[PDB]
Amino acid sequence: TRTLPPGVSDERFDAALQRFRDVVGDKWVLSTADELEAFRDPYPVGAAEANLPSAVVSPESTEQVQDIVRIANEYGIPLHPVSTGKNNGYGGAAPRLSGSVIVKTGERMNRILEVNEKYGYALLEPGVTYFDLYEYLQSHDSGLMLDCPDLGWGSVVGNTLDRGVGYTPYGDHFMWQTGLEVVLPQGEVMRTGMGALPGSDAWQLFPYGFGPFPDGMFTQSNLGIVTKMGIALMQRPPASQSFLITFDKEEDLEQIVDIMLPLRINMAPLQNVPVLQNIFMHAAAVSKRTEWFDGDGPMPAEAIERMKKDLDLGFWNFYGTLYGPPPLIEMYYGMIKEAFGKIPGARFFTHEERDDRGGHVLQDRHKINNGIPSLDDLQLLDWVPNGGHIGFVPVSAPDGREAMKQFEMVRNRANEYNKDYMAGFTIGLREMYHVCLFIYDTADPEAREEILQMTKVLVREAAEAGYGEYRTHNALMDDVMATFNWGDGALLKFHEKIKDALDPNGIIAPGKSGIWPQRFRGQ
Amino acid sequence: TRTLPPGVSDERFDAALQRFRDVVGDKWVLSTADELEAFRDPYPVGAAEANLPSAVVSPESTEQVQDIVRIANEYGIPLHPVSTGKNNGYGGAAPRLSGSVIVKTGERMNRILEVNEKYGYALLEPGVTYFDLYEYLQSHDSGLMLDCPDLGWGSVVGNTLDRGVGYTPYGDHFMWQTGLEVVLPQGEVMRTGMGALPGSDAWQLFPYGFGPFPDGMFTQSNLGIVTKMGIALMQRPPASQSFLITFDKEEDLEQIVDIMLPLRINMAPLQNVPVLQNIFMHAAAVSKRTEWFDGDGPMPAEAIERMKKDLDLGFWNFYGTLYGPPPLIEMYYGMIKEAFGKIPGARFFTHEERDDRGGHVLQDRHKINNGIPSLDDLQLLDWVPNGGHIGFVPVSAPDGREAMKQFEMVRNRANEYNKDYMAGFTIGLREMYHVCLFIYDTADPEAREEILQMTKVLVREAAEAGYGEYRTHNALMDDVMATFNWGDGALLKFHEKIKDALDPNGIIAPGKSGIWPQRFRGQ
Ligand SMILES: *Cc1cc2c(cc1C)nc1c(=O)[nH]c(=O)nc-1n2C[C@H](O)[C@H](O)[C@H](O)COP(=O)(O)OP(=O)(O)OC[C@H]1O[C@@H](n2cnc3c(N)ncnc32)[C@H](O)[C@@H]1O
Ligand SMILES: *Cc1cc2c(cc1C)nc1c(=O)[nH]c(=O)nc-1n2C[C@H](O)[C@H](O)[C@H](O)COP(=O)(O)OP(=O)(O)OC[C@H]1O[C@@H](n2cnc3c(N)ncnc32)[C@H](O)[C@@H]1O
């Protein structure tokens, strides 16, 4: 069943493969069943085998990436660029279009090119993971801290370019991205910002450069392959304090949101990203599902109460962190206690005060909120056997009623599909995320098809209520982009015009974010 | 000499004009010499008549803007979109390409569509000036403050889309821009971000939306005409304190910069944009040049000393502002005094302590740094008769030696052209601006040609030392874009591919930021 790129003969592909090996070296071009097994989406969705790579090519230099791209152009081979290819929750390393060659840039392009203590930035290659970088910072006893997502094994660049987020004050990764080098779809190479001016020291100091500001167009994008990217790094504060706030009632959501907003909007006293997660989220962190209920299908209210009482946690649980000199920390912690204190049954705990099994999450958020990469959230996959996950994160105004409506909306449709409402609400500055995680048996084809359908429904429903996803799984890219159809799909038509201008042979990551080049449209 | 669009007959233009009048109304289409005089660059540069509009069209609705664009497409008429057309220092309202129709969106599209106290944003049309908006905020007794540039008569949208800056903590305008509506070059209309999702309340709450993030591409851009744009508005703090720091020695620059940086980089204790301006800048604010020296050509050192002694000001003068509860203000003001205090001859003054004639600037920066639009900087045009100005602002790393090198570099070449070094250094977060303003006789054709040459030289020289401009005058767009030529002009080739994809008839603002569509290239 040898996987072949669309409309490419066995012969031409053998030639191309040869030319690829000529570029990177025989060792670093894979093209057999056994070898290609490793790059399967590790959390598959759907019953069906979807996404299947024709080869993997691991280049070591920008110049190689250029050569590959030129070759792919000649032969009309689709390319799927990845950094680490651990985009887990959103489709791992599997290409939207079958028969694509995966370009694994991060396998060999994994250098920390520069870290600068004075101006507080780093310039990185795609292969640099959050662990790799944190190690460097500890090794060299830096005064800087990174900002990490939940799972630290991923690329810093990869994450940034999916507009991923973290929970320190530098939590909007794209905001702090400064400068990148990218290979455009026909093999040209380009630098943005002050990188475009030979000799400039400001590549990682000033993002915008001169003329139209393009970096954004390389996020959630198929307009190139990024080979280098800068990111600002905040200075480690003198001290920090994490804390939990347990709220008993499921109805506390309304007043929690409406109180969070005015504490966050001026980046004080809530200086990190406020995150509020439900009880099911805390159970999965520590226990298996069978511990609380052994029926297939939804949990009864008695289970929920047992989970609350045993772990000693509210239905909603809020986690914040404060940074600065201890006066300021105390001053702010007080303001926060006075603020949320006005909700019946609101208990408060610092990262000192809880070493019990319910305070596991608090210990974990203390690490994350301080730029310490973990893999703690993989423990949430032991909730059920063969556990995997899919992410769904609609965006809305930070209003209690609106939050309550989302809670009802999702949990409802979730129970219809016999799945647990593992959800949270977080707030950026003026915006609300409904961070839903759904855990499922990855070895059961039914379960996979069910999850796919469920999210597709959640997406359709959310969009009908005015809620769009900020990011989605490989499997729902087409669906999600269809929700952003104002002006009769004006946005996507724009994306398409640009896609076709930079990528006339339709080479790069066809379908990414729902954007297909001309030769794939009509399908 | 009736001005005509490139390659359009008197007849076709008369038809088009008719079709334009059909769209907007006879009153709002201008096309005679007397009428068109008003839209001349009010601060001309060069001896020669450059830039000359064939008509002005003032639409009232997005839908009209669409109709105009469709008409312009048919006839191949170039369009020059403006909001207010007070881009003074950078070419006013005059089109890069002669025979262009100016679209004055801000004449009639000047509504404040929404201001939202809870979430802290506004949604604006192009015609809303900083005065218009500030009035609204005072009228409605808002808890919000705007962030204004030096000259308040300009558009909020216009400014934002040139990546203009201000001096409050919300001083990076583009950063706070959230959502826009734009008419693309073939007349299509589009919304970015959560605006693209029908029903979403998050258009001004979350900038990025889904898929590639395009807003940046409409800054310093000729890729459309913006009809609506959102901007976040910071909450007015409880209280504020502005302050001056006079430094005697011209050599104090080195240590001033190296001390400013670490006070700014964590947005505290320097919470506004630190701005340091030289003595000549303060003289022009209050006096005429003849007052200090009556020779044509550079000022002698005795004059400079007289200016210092009379106004009671250093060669460099630093202006900051602090925001918050009075404890925090005092705590930060102290840290700042201790910090800069380590420089011989450094005196400190609050906005209370100086009502003399040297403290005029301090009074003005207190207004600006607090979101109070002025036109105070027009007083700098009385330095010489028929005064006008051109801006030149290179970007560099915030390093003392680097600053000192820029100071020497510019002042040197400035004196060769018999012009005064009206300059400042400011710092964003991790970046340095060399804010040079050059004032000149606008009624003297020699003076105009001299200024043009001078800046072109300053630009060439700066670029050779690794310094690019963040923004430039109409007259040097081609020159500046030529400095960003890494990878053999990779950046501009990219811009061109996109320009040609969205604008196949080459309609919108040909030449803006050096970006010409196919039909104008080879010239
Ligand atoms: C399973 C899971 C995942 C997860 C999470 C919690 C769980 C239980 N929590 C997250 C969180 O709090 N925040 C967040 O941002 N992500 C979170 N995730 C997801 C995931 O593990 C992380 O996002 C991770 O940082 C992303 O993985 P990685 O960094 O390995 O990404 P990639 O495959 O290389 O890149 C993803 C996409 O980006 C584009 N891309 C990547 N590299 C390039 C280059 N060089 N050029 C162009 N485009 C590039 C591609 O479209 C690629 O598919
Ligand atoms: C003379 C002067 C100018 C000045 C200044 C001090 C002096 C003495 N100080 C400034 C400062 O501190 N900060 C700053 O950002 N600007 C400063 N200036 C310059 C100027 O007065 C201001 O920048 C002003 O805000 C800009 O003028 P305006 O707001 O009137 O701009 P415009 O002509 O309408 O727009 C300029 C360009 O933007 C693009 N544009 C504008 N509208 C649109 C629409 N609707 N669609 C697409 N593009 C648009 C055009 O390219 C236009 O030429």
PDB file of N, CA, C and O in Angstrom, chain A residues 118-120 163 170 172 188-189 191 196-197 205-206 208 211-212 220 235 266 399 430 433 466 468 484-486 497 501, chain B residues 118-120 163 170 172 188 191 196-197 205-206 208 211-212 220 235 266 399 430 433 466 468 484-486 490 497 501:
ATOM      1  N   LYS A 118      20.949  40.804  29.340  1.00  0.00           N
ATOM      2  CA  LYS A 118      20.815  42.249  29.473  1.00  0.00           C
ATOM      3  C   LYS A 118      19.465  42.709  28.929  1.00  0.00           C
ATOM      4  O   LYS A 118      18.742  43.412  29.620  1.00  0.00           O
ATOM      5  N   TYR A 119      19.126  42.290  27.705  1.00  0.00           N
ATOM      6  CA  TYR A 119      17.910  42.728  27.039  1.00  0.00           C
ATOM      7  C   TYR A 119      16.771  41.728  27.206  1.00  0.00           C
ATOM      8  O   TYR A 119      15.630  42.050  26.939  1.00  0.00           O
ATOM      9  N   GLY A 120      17.065  40.517  27.657  1.00  0.00           N
ATOM     10  CA  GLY A 120      16.003  39.636  28.122  1.00  0.00           C
ATOM     11  C   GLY A 120      15.243  38.989  26.967  1.00  0.00           C
ATOM     12  O   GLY A 120      14.023  39.135  26.874  1.00  0.00           O
ATOM     13  N   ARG A 163       0.033  30.055  18.384  1.00  0.00           N
ATOM     14  CA  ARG A 163      -0.505  31.048  19.300  1.00  0.00           C
ATOM     15  C   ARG A 163      -0.932  30.348  20.581  1.00  0.00           C
ATOM     16  O   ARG A 163      -1.986  30.627  21.140  1.00  0.00           O
ATOM     17  N   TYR A 170       4.001  36.665  30.976  1.00  0.00           N
ATOM     18  CA  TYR A 170       4.373  36.571  29.572  1.00  0.00           C
ATOM     19  C   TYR A 170       3.608  35.429  28.885  1.00  0.00           C
ATOM     20  O   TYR A 170       4.145  34.735  28.038  1.00  0.00           O
ATOM     21  N   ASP A 172       1.014  35.326  26.793  1.00  0.00           N
ATOM     22  CA  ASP A 172       0.657  35.469  25.388  1.00  0.00           C
ATOM     23  C   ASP A 172       1.947  35.363  24.577  1.00  0.00           C
ATOM     24  O   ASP A 172       2.648  36.356  24.363  1.00  0.00           O
ATOM     25  N   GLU A 188      12.507  30.538  -1.158  1.00  0.00           N
ATOM     26  CA  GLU A 188      13.099  31.800  -0.734  1.00  0.00           C
ATOM     27  C   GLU A 188      13.185  31.790   0.791  1.00  0.00           C
ATOM     28  O   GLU A 188      12.420  31.090   1.453  1.00  0.00           O
ATOM     29  N   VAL A 189      14.108  32.585   1.332  1.00  0.00           N
ATOM     30  CA  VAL A 189      14.280  32.699   2.765  1.00  0.00           C
ATOM     31  C   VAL A 189      14.175  34.170   3.128  1.00  0.00           C
ATOM     32  O   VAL A 189      14.624  35.020   2.375  1.00  0.00           O
ATOM     33  N   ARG A 191      13.668  37.208   6.579  1.00  0.00           N
ATOM     34  CA  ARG A 191      13.680  37.607   7.971  1.00  0.00           C
ATOM     35  C   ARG A 191      12.744  38.790   8.154  1.00  0.00           C
ATOM     36  O   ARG A 191      12.719  39.677   7.299  1.00  0.00           O
ATOM     37  N   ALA A 196      15.570  42.095   9.049  1.00  0.00           N
ATOM     38  CA  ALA A 196      15.595  42.349   7.618  1.00  0.00           C
ATOM     39  C   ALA A 196      16.610  43.433   7.280  1.00  0.00           C
ATOM     40  O   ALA A 196      16.869  43.688   6.109  1.00  0.00           O
ATOM     41  N   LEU A 197      17.114  44.112   8.314  1.00  0.00           N
ATOM     42  CA  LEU A 197      18.127  45.135   8.141  1.00  0.00           C
ATOM     43  C   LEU A 197      19.499  44.581   8.515  1.00  0.00           C
ATOM     44  O   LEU A 197      19.764  44.327   9.679  1.00  0.00           O
ATOM     45  N   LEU A 205      14.352  42.798  19.638  1.00  0.00           N
ATOM     46  CA  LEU A 205      14.143  43.921  20.545  1.00  0.00           C
ATOM     47  C   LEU A 205      12.916  44.722  20.127  1.00  0.00           C
ATOM     48  O   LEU A 205      12.255  45.323  20.978  1.00  0.00           O
ATOM     49  N   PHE A 206      12.662  44.745  18.808  1.00  0.00           N
ATOM     50  CA  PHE A 206      11.545  45.457  18.223  1.00  0.00           C
ATOM     51  C   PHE A 206      10.865  44.563  17.193  1.00  0.00           C
ATOM     52  O   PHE A 206      11.474  44.211  16.188  1.00  0.00           O
ATOM     53  N   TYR A 208       8.273  44.918  14.961  1.00  0.00           N
ATOM     54  CA  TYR A 208       7.462  45.380  13.844  1.00  0.00           C
ATOM     55  C   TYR A 208       8.327  45.690  12.617  1.00  0.00           C
ATOM     56  O   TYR A 208       7.876  45.564  11.481  1.00  0.00           O
ATOM     57  N   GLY A 211       7.194  48.773   7.289  1.00  0.00           N
ATOM     58  CA  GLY A 211       6.206  48.337   6.318  1.00  0.00           C
ATOM     59  C   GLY A 211       5.227  47.389   6.982  1.00  0.00           C
ATOM     60  O   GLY A 211       5.189  47.295   8.208  1.00  0.00           O
ATOM     61  N   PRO A 212       4.423  46.641   6.199  1.00  0.00           N
ATOM     62  CA  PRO A 212       3.466  45.703   6.782  1.00  0.00           C
ATOM     63  C   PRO A 212       4.156  44.722   7.711  1.00  0.00           C
ATOM     64  O   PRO A 212       5.248  44.236   7.405  1.00  0.00           O
ATOM     65  N   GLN A 220      -0.514  29.784  12.949  1.00  0.00           N
ATOM     66  CA  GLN A 220      -1.610  28.982  12.433  1.00  0.00           C
ATOM     67  C   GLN A 220      -1.633  29.075  10.911  1.00  0.00           C
ATOM     68  O   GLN A 220      -2.664  29.323  10.308  1.00  0.00           O
ATOM     69  N   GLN A 235      12.190  38.710  33.367  1.00  0.00           N
ATOM     70  CA  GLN A 235      13.119  38.536  34.473  1.00  0.00           C
ATOM     71  C   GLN A 235      12.430  37.822  35.626  1.00  0.00           C
ATOM     72  O   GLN A 235      11.301  38.177  35.972  1.00  0.00           O
ATOM     73  N   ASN A 266      -6.335  45.117  34.807  1.00  0.00           N
ATOM     74  CA  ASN A 266      -5.198  46.033  34.928  1.00  0.00           C
ATOM     75  C   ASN A 266      -3.956  45.259  35.357  1.00  0.00           C
ATOM     76  O   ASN A 266      -3.099  45.816  36.027  1.00  0.00           O
ATOM     77  N   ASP A 399     -18.062  37.302  31.058  1.00  0.00           N
ATOM     78  CA  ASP A 399     -19.305  37.612  31.732  1.00  0.00           C
ATOM     79  C   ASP A 399     -19.863  36.333  32.342  1.00  0.00           C
ATOM     80  O   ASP A 399     -19.906  35.301  31.670  1.00  0.00           O
ATOM     81  N   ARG A 430      -9.060  40.683  28.574  1.00  0.00           N
ATOM     82  CA  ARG A 430     -10.434  41.112  28.399  1.00  0.00           C
ATOM     83  C   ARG A 430     -11.271  40.061  27.676  1.00  0.00           C
ATOM     84  O   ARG A 430     -12.259  40.409  27.060  1.00  0.00           O
ATOM     85  N   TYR A 433     -11.794  32.175  27.925  1.00  0.00           N
ATOM     86  CA  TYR A 433     -11.595  30.869  27.328  1.00  0.00           C
ATOM     87  C   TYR A 433     -12.417  29.847  28.102  1.00  0.00           C
ATOM     88  O   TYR A 433     -12.460  29.877  29.333  1.00  0.00           O
ATOM     89  N   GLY A 466     -22.260  32.408  19.188  1.00  0.00           N
ATOM     90  CA  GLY A 466     -21.313  33.506  19.000  1.00  0.00           C
ATOM     91  C   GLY A 466     -19.910  33.215  19.553  1.00  0.00           C
ATOM     92  O   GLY A 466     -19.139  34.135  19.820  1.00  0.00           O
ATOM     93  N   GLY A 468     -16.282  31.345  18.944  1.00  0.00           N
ATOM     94  CA  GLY A 468     -15.293  30.728  18.074  1.00  0.00           C
ATOM     95  C   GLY A 468     -14.103  30.165  18.850  1.00  0.00           C
ATOM     96  O   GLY A 468     -13.752  30.648  19.927  1.00  0.00           O
ATOM     97  N   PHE A 484     -16.073  31.068  10.849  1.00  0.00           N
ATOM     98  CA  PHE A 484     -15.621  32.450  10.734  1.00  0.00           C
ATOM     99  C   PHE A 484     -15.966  32.979   9.353  1.00  0.00           C
ATOM    100  O   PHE A 484     -15.119  33.525   8.646  1.00  0.00           O
ATOM    101  N   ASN A 485     -17.263  32.929   9.058  1.00  0.00           N
ATOM    102  CA  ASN A 485     -17.760  33.093   7.708  1.00  0.00           C
ATOM    103  C   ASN A 485     -18.449  34.440   7.497  1.00  0.00           C
ATOM    104  O   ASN A 485     -19.148  34.580   6.502  1.00  0.00           O
ATOM    105  N   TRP A 486     -18.237  35.429   8.379  1.00  0.00           N
ATOM    106  CA  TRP A 486     -18.820  36.759   8.197  1.00  0.00           C
ATOM    107  C   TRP A 486     -18.478  37.282   6.809  1.00  0.00           C
ATOM    108  O   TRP A 486     -17.409  36.977   6.277  1.00  0.00           O
ATOM    109  N   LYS A 497      -6.308  33.804  -1.283  1.00  0.00           N
ATOM    110  CA  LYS A 497      -5.609  34.657  -2.229  1.00  0.00           C
ATOM    111  C   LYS A 497      -4.116  34.691  -1.867  1.00  0.00           C
ATOM    112  O   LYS A 497      -3.254  34.550  -2.732  1.00  0.00           O
ATOM    113  N   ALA A 501      -0.722  33.073  -3.712  1.00  0.00           N
ATOM    114  CA  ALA A 501       0.309  33.973  -4.197  1.00  0.00           C
ATOM    115  C   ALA A 501       1.692  33.499  -3.742  1.00  0.00           C
ATOM    116  O   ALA A 501       2.647  33.581  -4.493  1.00  0.00           O
TER     117      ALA A 501
ATOM    118  N   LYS B 118     -16.993  48.592  30.834  1.00  0.00           N
ATOM    119  CA  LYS B 118     -16.782  47.355  31.575  1.00  0.00           C
ATOM    120  C   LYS B 118     -15.524  46.647  31.078  1.00  0.00           C
ATOM    121  O   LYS B 118     -14.669  46.300  31.880  1.00  0.00           O
ATOM    122  N   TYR B 119     -15.409  46.461  29.759  1.00  0.00           N
ATOM    123  CA  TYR B 119     -14.304  45.724  29.168  1.00  0.00           C
ATOM    124  C   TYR B 119     -13.194  46.648  28.679  1.00  0.00           C
ATOM    125  O   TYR B 119     -12.100  46.195  28.399  1.00  0.00           O
ATOM    126  N   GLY B 120     -13.456  47.943  28.582  1.00  0.00           N
ATOM    127  CA  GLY B 120     -12.368  48.896  28.422  1.00  0.00           C
ATOM    128  C   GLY B 120     -11.835  48.928  26.991  1.00  0.00           C
ATOM    129  O   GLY B 120     -10.643  48.708  26.772  1.00  0.00           O
ATOM    130  N   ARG B 163       1.377  52.476  12.932  1.00  0.00           N
ATOM    131  CA  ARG B 163       2.099  51.976  14.092  1.00  0.00           C
ATOM    132  C   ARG B 163       2.704  53.158  14.834  1.00  0.00           C
ATOM    133  O   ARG B 163       3.846  53.117  15.276  1.00  0.00           O
ATOM    134  N   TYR B 170      -0.185  52.354  27.612  1.00  0.00           N
ATOM    135  CA  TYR B 170      -0.788  51.825  26.399  1.00  0.00           C
ATOM    136  C   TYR B 170      -0.193  52.508  25.158  1.00  0.00           C
ATOM    137  O   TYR B 170      -0.889  52.771  24.192  1.00  0.00           O
ATOM    138  N   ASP B 172       2.012  51.563  22.843  1.00  0.00           N
ATOM    139  CA  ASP B 172       2.137  50.793  21.612  1.00  0.00           C
ATOM    140  C   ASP B 172       0.727  50.576  21.066  1.00  0.00           C
ATOM    141  O   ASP B 172       0.040  49.620  21.438  1.00  0.00           O
ATOM    142  N   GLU B 188     -14.134  43.800  -1.962  1.00  0.00           N
ATOM    143  CA  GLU B 188     -14.597  42.885  -0.928  1.00  0.00           C
ATOM    144  C   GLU B 188     -14.430  43.579   0.423  1.00  0.00           C
ATOM    145  O   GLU B 188     -13.594  44.470   0.565  1.00  0.00           O
ATOM    146  N   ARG B 191     -13.732  41.344   8.013  1.00  0.00           N
ATOM    147  CA  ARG B 191     -13.498  41.609   9.417  1.00  0.00           C
ATOM    148  C   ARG B 191     -12.499  40.597   9.952  1.00  0.00           C
ATOM    149  O   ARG B 191     -12.581  39.421   9.592  1.00  0.00           O
ATOM    150  N   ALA B 196     -15.005  38.156  12.684  1.00  0.00           N
ATOM    151  CA  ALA B 196     -15.256  37.290  11.543  1.00  0.00           C
ATOM    152  C   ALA B 196     -16.270  36.210  11.899  1.00  0.00           C
ATOM    153  O   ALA B 196     -16.709  35.469  11.027  1.00  0.00           O
ATOM    154  N   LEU B 197     -16.569  36.085  13.196  1.00  0.00           N
ATOM    155  CA  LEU B 197     -17.555  35.134  13.668  1.00  0.00           C
ATOM    156  C   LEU B 197     -18.867  35.850  13.977  1.00  0.00           C
ATOM    157  O   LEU B 197     -18.945  36.608  14.930  1.00  0.00           O
ATOM    158  N   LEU B 205     -12.022  42.213  22.104  1.00  0.00           N
ATOM    159  CA  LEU B 205     -11.622  41.606  23.369  1.00  0.00           C
ATOM    160  C   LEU B 205     -10.450  40.655  23.156  1.00  0.00           C
ATOM    161  O   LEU B 205      -9.634  40.473  24.063  1.00  0.00           O
ATOM    162  N   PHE B 206     -10.417  40.036  21.965  1.00  0.00           N
ATOM    163  CA  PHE B 206      -9.386  39.094  21.583  1.00  0.00           C
ATOM    164  C   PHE B 206      -8.922  39.406  20.166  1.00  0.00           C
ATOM    165  O   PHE B 206      -9.702  39.294  19.226  1.00  0.00           O
ATOM    166  N   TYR B 208      -6.723  37.988  17.933  1.00  0.00           N
ATOM    167  CA  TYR B 208      -6.092  37.044  17.023  1.00  0.00           C
ATOM    168  C   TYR B 208      -7.135  36.253  16.226  1.00  0.00           C
ATOM    169  O   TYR B 208      -6.883  35.840  15.097  1.00  0.00           O
ATOM    170  N   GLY B 211      -6.780  31.071  12.734  1.00  0.00           N
ATOM    171  CA  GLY B 211      -5.984  30.987  11.521  1.00  0.00           C
ATOM    172  C   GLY B 211      -4.948  32.093  11.519  1.00  0.00           C
ATOM    173  O   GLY B 211      -4.710  32.723  12.548  1.00  0.00           O
ATOM    174  N   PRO B 212      -4.314  32.380  10.363  1.00  0.00           N
ATOM    175  CA  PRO B 212      -3.312  33.440  10.298  1.00  0.00           C
ATOM    176  C   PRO B 212      -3.876  34.760  10.790  1.00  0.00           C
ATOM    177  O   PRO B 212      -5.022  35.100  10.485  1.00  0.00           O
ATOM    178  N   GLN B 220       1.005  50.267   7.943  1.00  0.00           N
ATOM    179  CA  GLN B 220       1.968  50.709   6.949  1.00  0.00           C
ATOM    180  C   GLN B 220       1.742  49.946   5.649  1.00  0.00           C
ATOM    181  O   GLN B 220       2.668  49.413   5.058  1.00  0.00           O
ATOM    182  N   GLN B 235      -7.778  51.919  31.986  1.00  0.00           N
ATOM    183  CA  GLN B 235      -8.516  52.604  33.034  1.00  0.00           C
ATOM    184  C   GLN B 235      -7.675  53.731  33.614  1.00  0.00           C
ATOM    185  O   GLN B 235      -6.491  53.524  33.890  1.00  0.00           O
ATOM    186  N   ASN B 266      10.967  46.106  33.046  1.00  0.00           N
ATOM    187  CA  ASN B 266       9.904  45.386  33.750  1.00  0.00           C
ATOM    188  C   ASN B 266       8.721  46.319  33.987  1.00  0.00           C
ATOM    189  O   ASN B 266       8.010  46.154  34.967  1.00  0.00           O
ATOM    190  N   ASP B 399      21.594  50.951  24.313  1.00  0.00           N
ATOM    191  CA  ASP B 399      22.942  50.927  24.838  1.00  0.00           C
ATOM    192  C   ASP B 399      23.543  52.321  24.711  1.00  0.00           C
ATOM    193  O   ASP B 399      23.434  52.940  23.652  1.00  0.00           O
ATOM    194  N   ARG B 430      12.445  47.175  25.133  1.00  0.00           N
ATOM    195  CA  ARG B 430      13.786  46.659  24.943  1.00  0.00           C
ATOM    196  C   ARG B 430      14.450  47.242  23.699  1.00  0.00           C
ATOM    197  O   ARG B 430      15.336  46.616  23.150  1.00  0.00           O
ATOM    198  N   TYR B 433      14.697  54.380  20.306  1.00  0.00           N
ATOM    199  CA  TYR B 433      14.350  55.288  19.231  1.00  0.00           C
ATOM    200  C   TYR B 433      15.247  56.515  19.318  1.00  0.00           C
ATOM    201  O   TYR B 433      15.495  57.036  20.406  1.00  0.00           O
ATOM    202  N   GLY B 466      23.570  49.853  10.996  1.00  0.00           N
ATOM    203  CA  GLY B 466      22.650  48.826  11.478  1.00  0.00           C
ATOM    204  C   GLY B 466      21.347  49.388  12.067  1.00  0.00           C
ATOM    205  O   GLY B 466      20.668  48.715  12.840  1.00  0.00           O
ATOM    206  N   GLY B 468      17.598  50.930  11.297  1.00  0.00           N
ATOM    207  CA  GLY B 468      16.455  51.131  10.420  1.00  0.00           C
ATOM    208  C   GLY B 468      15.388  52.028  11.048  1.00  0.00           C
ATOM    209  O   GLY B 468      15.240  52.092  12.268  1.00  0.00           O
ATOM    210  N   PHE B 484      16.039  47.567   4.092  1.00  0.00           N
ATOM    211  CA  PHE B 484      15.629  46.298   4.684  1.00  0.00           C
ATOM    212  C   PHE B 484      15.761  45.195   3.650  1.00  0.00           C
ATOM    213  O   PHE B 484      14.831  44.424   3.412  1.00  0.00           O
ATOM    214  N   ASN B 485      16.988  45.057   3.153  1.00  0.00           N
ATOM    215  CA  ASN B 485      17.261  44.287   1.957  1.00  0.00           C
ATOM    216  C   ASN B 485      17.957  42.961   2.259  1.00  0.00           C
ATOM    217  O   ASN B 485      18.488  42.364   1.331  1.00  0.00           O
ATOM    218  N   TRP B 486      17.934  42.481   3.512  1.00  0.00           N
ATOM    219  CA  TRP B 486      18.531  41.188   3.850  1.00  0.00           C
ATOM    220  C   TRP B 486      17.985  40.113   2.920  1.00  0.00           C
ATOM    221  O   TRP B 486      16.831  40.189   2.493  1.00  0.00           O
ATOM    222  N   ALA B 490      14.526  40.234   0.289  1.00  0.00           N
ATOM    223  CA  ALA B 490      13.550  39.160   0.438  1.00  0.00           C
ATOM    224  C   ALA B 490      12.216  39.712   0.928  1.00  0.00           C
ATOM    225  O   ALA B 490      11.155  39.315   0.452  1.00  0.00           O
ATOM    226  N   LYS B 497       4.514  40.084  -3.731  1.00  0.00           N
ATOM    227  CA  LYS B 497       3.702  38.927  -4.065  1.00  0.00           C
ATOM    228  C   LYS B 497       2.292  39.117  -3.484  1.00  0.00           C
ATOM    229  O   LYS B 497       1.294  38.890  -4.166  1.00  0.00           O
ATOM    230  N   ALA B 501      -1.421  39.871  -5.267  1.00  0.00           N
ATOM    231  CA  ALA B 501      -2.483  38.891  -5.119  1.00  0.00           C
ATOM    232  C   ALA B 501      -3.789  39.573  -4.702  1.00  0.00           C
ATOM    233  O   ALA B 501      -4.851  39.200  -5.168  1.00  0.00           O
TER     234      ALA B 501
END
